[PDB]
Design a protein around this nucleic acid. Structure first.
Ligand SMILES: [Zn+2]
Ligand SMILES: [Zn+2]
Length: 70
RNA sequence: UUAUUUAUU
């Protein structure tokens, strides 16, 4: 998968252990975080779901603008 | 509208 180790392994960051071990598809260290190939218009238009429901099921992985302030 | 994204041995 192109998403391999593109996101932190949350169970490893929370408890320091992971049942997937060296085969875990998520990052156990920031040294393993790779670069995501994203659409050239990534976050250039307002996310309809976040600007309508106040939330978005894609979370920080959404390809559209949620809040313009960090 | 670019209308999208892996919780996985
Ligand atoms: Zn893990
Ligand atoms: Zn969104």
């Amino acid at each position: 998968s192109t998403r391999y180790k593109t996101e932190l392994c949350r169970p490893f960051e929370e408890s320091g252990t992971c049942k997937y071990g060296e085969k875990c598809q998520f990052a156990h260290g920031f040294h393993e975080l790779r670069s995501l190939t994203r659409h050239p218009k990534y976050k250039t238009e307002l996310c309809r779901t976040f600007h309508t429901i106040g939330f978005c099921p894609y979370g920080p992985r959404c390809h559209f603008i949620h809040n313009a302030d960090e």
